[model samples]
Target: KVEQAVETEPEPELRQQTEWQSGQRWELALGRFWDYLRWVQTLSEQVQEELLSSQVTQELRALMDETMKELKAYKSELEEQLTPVAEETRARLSKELQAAQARLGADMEDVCGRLVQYRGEVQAMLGQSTEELRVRLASHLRKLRKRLLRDADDLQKRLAVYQAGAREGAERGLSAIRERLGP
Candidate 1:
């Protein structure tokens, strides 16, 4: 009876340890599975972030390029239109001035014939006023040219400001994306 009792006790003790060890082994396997799931999720999240950052960069670059092109084209068109108009205005003004000068000369000759004694005085006054008129006309033309140049320059300045703003905005977006991506 003592020998049979010892053998049976040994079998039960061995069985108990095996069952407990199997439970522990399964727990370890579950822990490893949990770790793998978290790792996959983290990797996918990073992938999404990287993709978004790249897409944002591409779109911003495209917008900047397109806007700059449009502004340059518009400026060129404005200049083309202004050139012909300015030339036409200058030509027409000069033609009218010449016609008025011819009329004034004919009128002065008629007046000189009618009042020969006052001719010298009338000529002096007419000459002085004509000189003043010429100076005023020349100054007016100069002013017009200056205004046109100033307007064109202002257009260039506006375009530069817009381009700078666009570039800054793009850089800001890129930097923000880079921050998210890290080193």
Candidate 2:
């Protein structure tokens, strides 16, 4: 079996704020930083010293102070909710590292076995006379080459199964993060 996938990811979207954003903390705090993203254009300047004593200006300064306090709470909530999910993903990555190292150990043992068989074959060849040795040596080399190719092919097929699974697992991890946090 063979499985292959190529994916191109798009930009991630920001999620709707949770209850933590009750009263739309960040949006109301600054009247939406990306407002021009829709209906807005801006003048060259906004609040100025000349408007310092203005009635609306005084009201805004007071409101702004309150909003800043609310923001502190929102940030704490945001951090707590988003932090642990990433830690688990990091844990998964480290576990994958351990898995790869384990496979290396297994592959190493298999290679050592192949080398021992090869050494034995060469030692047996030394006991053959010249004409007989040449014919027998060719037959032995042919079998060795066939076995090497077959083993490599088998390994590739096995690894492809694992590769396909890991590819899908990666896809799930991404969606898990998005679903956990939303978008």
Candidate 3:
């Protein structure tokens, strides 16, 4: 009876020990799972930050591209309107009168008078057009430049906000993880 009781007592003690170890393993698994969840949350926040930064950068680039296109188009249109008028004025002003001075003097006078009148009209047209073009183009350029600068400033502000948020998020996440992990 003594030998049988000793053997049975050892079996119960071993079972209790095994149960305690199993409970310990379950607790460790729960802790590790909680840590993993925290890590996943941190990773998700980082991804969100990266996505927002990319969106802002794309918007800035698009704004710059559009402004440049408008400026180029305005410059091209101005040059097209001004070049032919300038060439015509140069040709008329450089005309020689010696060749038709003898027999065609009276006719030449009429021709010169008509040329002068036409030149005056052309000059007036060019003056008005140039002044209008200058005013319009200057206004357009100023507006475009102002918009570009504003966009740039806004982008910078957004970037700073993103960076600050990201840093704060990281610090908070790390603090939470550290608290959970303990010293």
Candidate 4:
């Protein structure tokens, strides 16, 4: 009886084709991707800071190099684990991550580009309108600096959480794999 009921369920072809369904799915995917990107960006900022603060000595550079290598190894391990998931899920996630990364990259690039352009414009306008340009340029620089700092802080926090979560997930996955391949 249970088997008959299960077999009689409506086919996938019969599902409603509502715009809302697609919108909801997209929203969920976007949220997840945003969260992931925030984490990654934050981690990148933390790494940048670490690299910058280290003494400019051979020992410091060696430490930085080792840290970077470890990070790359962790990333590679995560990607390897992602490979065995169902193709559809993997594709969906990969697409979302790429989209998020592209969006963030573009945004950061645009901001920095604008800042450079503004600097050039200010330099050109300096003697002609020293007072006005100084006031305007200073304001713009201050705003940009504030925005960049906030973004760096947010990214750092997000990255820490992401790293923690990833570590936990990896541990669980490894344990599951070990159990499955029991002696």
Candidate 5:
């Protein structure tokens, strides 16, 4: 039961401490567990149904049946060919084991090499992304600095205009007052 349940691969943390801190947690834990079991049952039923109805499965079963018959026939052939006066089946099995070990070693090496290459590719992509972000951040900061400096220059220029206008206006008003008083 446990093997079947796990074979279907139910994912996620089944038990979370923080999420189930009170009465809510207890009810949730049981509910979640019950749901998980039901889910596995449903998944198994679906897989079985799919297998039962599949043309591919039928073909596979037929192929396996044919292969089994051939293997059995081969065994009979071997039984007939084996000599009681010879060194028995030791040489053939030893050679078979040696070939299988070589195949296994080659496959493992290939997998390891591919894994290293995959990590290298992933790291290169991350490095490219980091470089892009660095360039973008630097450009953004420069643009922001230019905007602030432009705004400061405009504020200073505008203030100077306002102060000069106020001082000249005062001069004109005093002159007008003196001329009105006849001098």
Candidate 6:
């Protein structure tokens, strides 16, 4: 029961952290590419070299253009997949939250009603009891208190189960984003 209650999967922290490191590396790589281009230009000027006479400048230009196309295409594709995933997840979470709220509220009332009835019966029995019987009645009340604590714990765990469901739904969406971004 404890192991099932604490089941952890689709850990977001590790994947989310790695997600943006790739982006930063891409930014750094692009910066270095520009540095290389500028340094080549300087070398060309110092040597009175004609880049126009060689196919090198044309090749570089074509490579840069294709790189921009790939970047823009990747951006649009991400937004396309992400937009519906986000909205659908948001809709489901809000709906589930409300559903669980109503369910837990009703269950709590049911539990409270049962406990109150039990307490009333126990108190009525105590009213007619002698000293030794009174001690026994006191023990019964202690047991009742223990049961209440256990039920309270069960209710709290139910709440956490719902919260975990919400997180798992969000994680599914995030995993999709990471998959699209690639390794």
Candidate with the larger TM-score of 2 and 3: 2
Q: For model 5, where is the 10-residue window of minimal lDDT? A: 157-166
For candidate 4, the 10 contiguous residues with the lowest summed lDDT are 157-166
Candidate 4 per-residue lDDT over residues 74-97, each given as its tens digit: 434343243223233333434444
Per-prediction TM-score, please? 0.20, 0.24, 0.22, 0.35, 0.22, 0.27
The prediction achieving the highest lDDT against the true structure is: 6
Q: Give lDDT tens digits, candidate 6, residues 1-183.
A: 222322234344433443443353223433343343334333223312223233334433433454344434443333233322234443443344334434433333333343344435544564554454334434543443344334433433332222222333344554333432432
Name model 1 segments beyond 4 Å from true. 1-72, 75-130, 163-183
Deviating ranges (above 4 Å) for candidate 3: 1-128, 165-183
Each candidate: how many clashes?
A: 0, 0, 0, 2, 0, 0
For each candidate in the order shown, give its overall lDDT on alpha carbons. 0.32, 0.33, 0.30, 0.36, 0.31, 0.37
lDDT tens per residue, model 2, 1-183: 111121112111111222232445433543331221111111112311212224323343443344344434443343223322233433443344234323433333333333344435545664555445334434544443344334433432222222222233343445323332322
Worst lDDT 10-window in candidate 1: 77-86
- Residue pairs with colliding backbones in model 1 are none
lDDT of 1 by residue, 12-76 (tens): 35334433433332223323422332232232334234222343234323333443345334433
Ranking by TM-score: 4, 6, 2, 3, 5, 1
Order the candidate numbers by lDDT, best to worst.
6, 4, 2, 1, 5, 3
Q: What is the lDDT of residue 65 in candidate 4?
A: 42
Off by over 4 Å in 2: 1-23, 32-56, 83-183
Write model 5 residue lDDT over 1-183, tens digit each, in one string: 122354234321222321232223222332332232223123233423332343223433333344234423432333322211112222333243234323422332332233233334434565455444344433443343344334333332221111221233333333222221222
Candidates 2 and 6 compared by lDDT, better number: 6
Error of 2 at 98 (Å): 36
Error of 1 at 160 (Å): 2.0
